[PDB]
Design a binder for this molecule. Structure first.
Ligand SMILES: [Zn+2]
Ligand SMILES: [Zn+2]
Lengths: 249, 407, 370, 142
């Protein structure tokens, strides 16, 4: 409809790619090195042309393997588009917890291309309604990744900040800061600001974990906003929090 | 000066400051019934409990005093129980004591082996065990369920296993219910859950639900535990359900999906299965039935052959059954050769230590008609000589020569 | 933002226009807290198929390896926004690979507190410091007085992060790193890890001193498996639990099918008499019912203990272990030489993992198990 | 079986450790013979071993075992019978916990023995026999 013309070589190798994708249903060729030729919009068209979301899990895994094997790294925009077409449907389709295939393939694809990967994945999955526990557990395992490197954890956090925070956001963030990850003061400020606003029990866990660990970062006005959000008895662990809050003072 | 400390002092216990064990003046029952009848007859009769527990919590705000309250006591008349236990023997404070106990423990998530290398939370839960009398059994249940829903993983792993010391004989149904209602959510924690469910007093109809539940949640497990899960399943199975569960299993296990990236665990898995079908028989006949009646399936997976080899290697009464069935699927063309190719290209390591089975089979393959069968046996001999060791190779040559000269 | 009058700021706040028409951009680009100079001149239209782009010579040295990727992406990019995003991602991966170029410490945090912590540990535990102050080695003493050294690598700011610790002993050393943990904290942890396997060393030094110890020659502290000589051209080997060292370690003999034969027969009927309270050497002397040649000749060549095929000792560290089941020969051999010899031989018949054949010297039946 | 495999457990360590875990899980198991055999195995363990790693952990863990057993006394008659049958040999090896043993025995004793002279039934014998729906049985063979 847009009249996006894919590169002509890409249109002509289209059958070779489409047979290879079919074969992986059962090392990297240059058919994958051709993907350097595109602008990211052409990649977007091409993904729909190639029926990536129509793949099987195993094929997704083999392809992930090949794309990780790739020489000079995929561009940010391209890689994002890919990720969307690759996982996003299956993710948002999940009633229940993901197959290990999807799990591990995801982990690897993140582990290499973590920033574009999760910039593609996290935001929409959690902006989505009915974002069930299954998906939170995948994102929990994503942030539990030993391969999720320090600066990666910071960009994960930095990206989480801008969102509408709900129970799922807190549940994720709990596991995210179990790593004892570094926070700039402005970022801890935004954290405590959102954290001030509220009966949720995982949210209780969140407030507890910050108060316990990042007491090194906590000040009096943050402790006050804490007290304000802590006052509720709809909370559990009231006492424990009061003792932690005392200890901050 | 507190109501609390005064009552304990008159009831005949040395409130040691909390460096050494608190000493004891009287028998456990003597002190318990003493303080019991004391506050019973005492005026301000319902409020004095609130005063008692408020003074308690105010005392155990301190670390070491609390620690020593938790610790066992010392006799003077020669090693006893702890104050907390003696106190929780009393029911009229129990649910108070219970409540007070939980909502402080969260402080002690990220405390870890400071001074005496003894872990506070474990030591807390220790207090909760083998409770003769439990007024608050059900509320307790609901509270530990809050706790278990929230717990950090390790703590979780501990308390959960600790559970059956804690509970009794009456209240387990809803317990298990909540557990499965957790398991549907989370699958990293099955194994403890599963041990505990083996431990508790249950109906089996629930076990079945959970079994189906995990069978769905069976591709969606990490690599390592997998074997023990299957171990559970195969313990859990019976005379009759067996066929169906196996069918589901045979449908859900893949082994192209499991990639030091899958080897050790696969191995261990096979071992486990090996043990299972060693220490019972009917698993094998059912398993065979299952791959045998998988007839319409021209989409046969790797697993099947591997298990066939194995069963051929093990109990032998059925060997003629196995031959028969394998001839029949071959003539049907449902079994073919790129199958065998990828089979020996990966899972051979499993087979090295049963190579002799392969040959004893190939022997019965080449003595038949129907070229495709004979070609199969060939490939057998070929790969056997190919991947395995010298003795194998030797046995290959020696079997082929026999075929030549005699055949 | 979605619009590049604000997204250009949000993502390259350092990168800003000079020209009236937003065609001449200059400024900087951030990367790992490093602002690199940049001047970028577009055509009259906002097409990147032409986009003049000069840099620092710093930056051109750092992008030696990707100028073709630059030529690609300038022409393939839809927008300057995504172009520069991918550029910064690229810069980060470049320096990530070239991460050998990176260190600078803050003194008053580092060079102040570190010598206070040295005085805390003890200047006599201090065995070495590096000219960088990057590496430092320290000494711990077993209660016997065995020295266990350990190396530590210090970052720019040390207590913020774990230092990289490198230790000799075999078990995986775990150092519970908090920023409250200091040099003496990790030193006590080092001692606690030492005191767990202390009583292991108390048997190991005993064995080192007493008997004809063979083949962890100059055994380090890592060594949990040992080898001892006994009799003549018959050697035993041991592997001990550091946690239960006086407990029976798993062992076996190397040597002859008539010398190793009754040794195990005694062991089978005296292992029940293993009293783990004694020393291991003392337990052995009664369990095996023998004395050792306690360094009785140790390392002095009488041509007895020699391969007879390769005529060597310690062939690739391999010991003359395989021998003849014959009083007259007792010719000891390696594994590899005896294997290769009985390989070509015609009479050499092969079972599962056995080669039978004639001893080279005496032509008597000799068995080799691989 | 366990009497037979004993000597391996004498020498070995890790086998003893794993077997301990096994008996631990076996005690809670909803079968009866599970608890019976876990008891027997513990009895055999402690009878055959002074030590079962600081020796104070060995002693407090033996104490843990014996406390679990003290509560397993609450179980039916045959269990307690098995306990009694073992305890003599237990002490014949390991005298060090005579106090923890005899305290326990004497508590259970006093729970059926009355401390008054001139009360001609000095014990409590309806206490040792329980009936739930006219189905009657011994408990605690005195
Ligand atoms: Zn040699
Ligand atoms: Zn010879």
């Amino acid at each position: 409809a847009e009249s996006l013309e894919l590169p002509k070589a890409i249109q002509d190798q289209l059958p070779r790619l489409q047979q290879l994708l079919k074969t992986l249903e059962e090392a990297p060729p240059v058919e994958l090195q051709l993907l350097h030729e595109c602008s990211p919009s052409q990649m977007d068209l091409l993904c729909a042309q190639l029926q990536l979301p129509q793949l099987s899990d195993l094929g997704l895994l083999r392809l992930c393997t090949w794309l990780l094997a790739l020489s000079p790294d995929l561009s940010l925009s391209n890689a994002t588009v890919l990720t969307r077409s690759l996982f996003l449907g299956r993710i948002l389709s999940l009633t229940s917890s993901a197959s290990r295939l999807l799990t591990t393939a995801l982990t690897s694809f993140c582990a290499k291309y973590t920033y574009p990967v999760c910039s593609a994945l996290l935001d929409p999955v959690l902006q989505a309604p009915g974002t069930g526990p299954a998906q939170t557990e995948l994102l929990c395992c994503l942030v539990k990744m030993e391969s999720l490197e320090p600066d990666a954890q910071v960009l994960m956090l930095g990206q989480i900040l801008e969102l509408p925070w709900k129970e799922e956001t807190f549940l994720v963030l709990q596991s995210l800061l179990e790593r004892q990850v570094e926070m700039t003061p402005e970022k801890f400020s935004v954290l405590m600001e959102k954290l001030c606003k509220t009966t949720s029990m995982a949210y209780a866990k969140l407030m507890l974990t910050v108060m316990t660990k990042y007491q090194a970062n906590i000040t009096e006005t943050q402790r006050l906003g804490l007290a304000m959000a802590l006052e509720p008895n709809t909370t559990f662990l009231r006492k424990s929090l009061k003792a932690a809050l005392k200890h901050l003072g | 000066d507190s109501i609390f400390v005064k009552l304990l002092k008159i009831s005949g216990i040395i409130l040691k400051t909390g460096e050494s064990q608190n000493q004891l003046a009287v028998d456990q029952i003597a002190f318990q019934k003493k303080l019991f009848q004391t506050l019973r007859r005492h005026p301000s009769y319902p409020k004095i409990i609130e005063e008692f527990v408020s003074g308690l919590e105010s005392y155990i705000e301190d670390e070491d005093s609390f620690r020593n309250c938790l610790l066992s006591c010392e006799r003077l008349q020669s090693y006893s129980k702890s104050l907390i236990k003696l106190l929780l023997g009393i029911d009229i404070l129990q649910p108070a004591i219970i409540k007070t106990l939980f909502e402080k423990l969260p402080e002690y998530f990220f405390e870890n082996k400071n001074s005496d290398e003894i872990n506070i939370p474990r030591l807390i839960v220790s207090q909760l065990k083998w409770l003769d009398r439990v007024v608050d059994g059900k509320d307790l249940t609901t509270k530990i369920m809050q706790l278990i829903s929230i717990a950090p993983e390790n703590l979780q792993h501990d308390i959960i296993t600790s559970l059956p010391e804690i509970l009794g004989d009456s209240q387990h149904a809803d317990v298990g219910k909540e557990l499965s209602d957790l398991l549907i959510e989370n699958t990293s924690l099955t194994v403890p859950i599963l041990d505990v469910l083996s431990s508790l007093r249950l109906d089996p109809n629930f076990l079945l639900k959970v079994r189906q539940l995990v069978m769905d949640k069976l591709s969606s497990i990490r690599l390592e535990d997998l074997p023990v899960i299957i171990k559970f399943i195969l313990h859990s199975v019976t005379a009759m359900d067996t066929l169906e569960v196996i069918s589901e299993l045979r449908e859900k296990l893949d082994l192209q999906h499991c990639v030091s990236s899958g080897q050790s665990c696969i191995i261990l898995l096979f071992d486990v299965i090996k043990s299972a079908i060693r220490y019972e028989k009917t698993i094998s006949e059912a398993w065979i039935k299952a791959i045998e009646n998988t007839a319409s399936v021209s989409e046969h997976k790797v697993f099947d052959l591997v298990m066939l080899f194995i069963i051929y290697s093990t109990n032998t009464q059925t060997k003629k059954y196995i031959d028969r069935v394998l001839r029949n699927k071959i003539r049907s063309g449902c079994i073919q050769e790129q199958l065998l190719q990828s089979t020996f290209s990966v899972h051979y390591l499993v087979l090295k230590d049963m190579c002799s089975s392969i040959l004893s089979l190939a022997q019965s393959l080449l003595h038949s008609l129907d070229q495709s069968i004979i070609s199969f046996g060939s490939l057998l001999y070929k790969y056997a000589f190919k991947f395995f060791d010298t003795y194998c190779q030797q046995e290959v040559v020696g079997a082929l020569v026999t075929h030549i000269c005699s055949g | 933002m979605a619009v590049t009058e604000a997204s250009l700021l949000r993502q390259c706040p350092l990168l800003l226009p000079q020209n009236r028409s937003k065609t001449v951009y200059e400024g900087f680009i951030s990367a790992q807290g490093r602002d690199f100079h940049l001047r970028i001149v577009l055509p009259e239209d906002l097409q990147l198929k032409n986009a003049r782009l000069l840099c620092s010579w710093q930056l051109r040295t750092i992008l030696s390896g990707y100028h073709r990727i630059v030529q690609q992406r300038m022409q393939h990019s839809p927008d300057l926004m995504s172009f520069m995003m991918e550029l910064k991602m690229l810069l980060e991966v470049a320096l990530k690979n070239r991460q050998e170029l990176y260190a600078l410490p803050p003194p008053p945090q580092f060079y102040s507190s570190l010598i206070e912590e040295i005085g805390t540990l003890g200047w006599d535990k201090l065995v070495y410091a590096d000219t960088c102050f990057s590496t430092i080695k320290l000494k711990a003493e077993d209660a016997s007085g065995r020295e266990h050294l350990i190396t530590l690598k210090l970052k720019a700011k040390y207590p913020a992060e774990s230092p990289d610790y490198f230790v000799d002993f075999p078990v995986p050393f775990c150092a519970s790193w908090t920023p409250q943990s200091s040099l003496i904290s990790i030193y006590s942890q080092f001692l606690a890890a030492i005191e767990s396997l202390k009583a292991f060393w108390d048997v190991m030094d005993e064995i080192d001193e007493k008997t004809w110890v063979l083949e962890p020659e100059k055994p380090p502290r890592s060594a949990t498996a040992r080898r001892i000589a006994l009799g003549n051209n018959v050697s035993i080997n041991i592997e001990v639990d550091p946690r239960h060292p006086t407990m029976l370690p798993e062992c076996f003999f190397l040597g002859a099918d008539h010398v190793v034969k009754p040794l195990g027969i005694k062991l089978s009927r005296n292992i029940h008499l293993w009293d783990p309270e004694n020393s291991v050497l003392q337990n052995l002397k009664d369990v095996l019912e023998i004395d050792f040649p306690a360094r009785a000749i140790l390392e002095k060549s009488d041509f007895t203990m020699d391969c007879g095929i390769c005529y060597a000792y310690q062939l690739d560290g391999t010991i003359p272990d395989q021998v003849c089941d014959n009083s007259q020969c007792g010719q000891p051999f390696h594994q590899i030489c005896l294997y290769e010899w009985l390989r070509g031989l015609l009479t050499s018949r092969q079972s599962f993992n056995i080669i039978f054949g004639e001893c080279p010297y005496c032509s008597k039946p000799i068995t080799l198990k691989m | 079986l366990l009497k037979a495999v004993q000597p391996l457990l004498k020498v070995s360590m890790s086998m003893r450790d794993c077997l301990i875990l096994v008996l631990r899980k076996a005690m809670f198991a909803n079968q009866l013979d599970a608890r019976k055999s876990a008891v027997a195995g513990f009895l055999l363990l402690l009878k055959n071993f002074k030590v079962l790693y600081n020796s104070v952990a060995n002693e407090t863990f033996c104490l843990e075992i014996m406390d679990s057993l003290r509560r397993c006394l609450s179980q039916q008659a045959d269990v307690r019978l098995m306990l009694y049958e073992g305890f003599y040999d237990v002490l014949r090896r390991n005298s060090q916990l005579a106090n923890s043993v005899m305290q326990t025995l004497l508590s259970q004793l006093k729970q059926f023995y009355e401390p008054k002279p001139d009360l001609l039934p000095p014990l409590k014998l309806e206490a040792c026999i329980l009936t739930q729906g006219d189905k009657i049985s011994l408990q605690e063979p005195l």
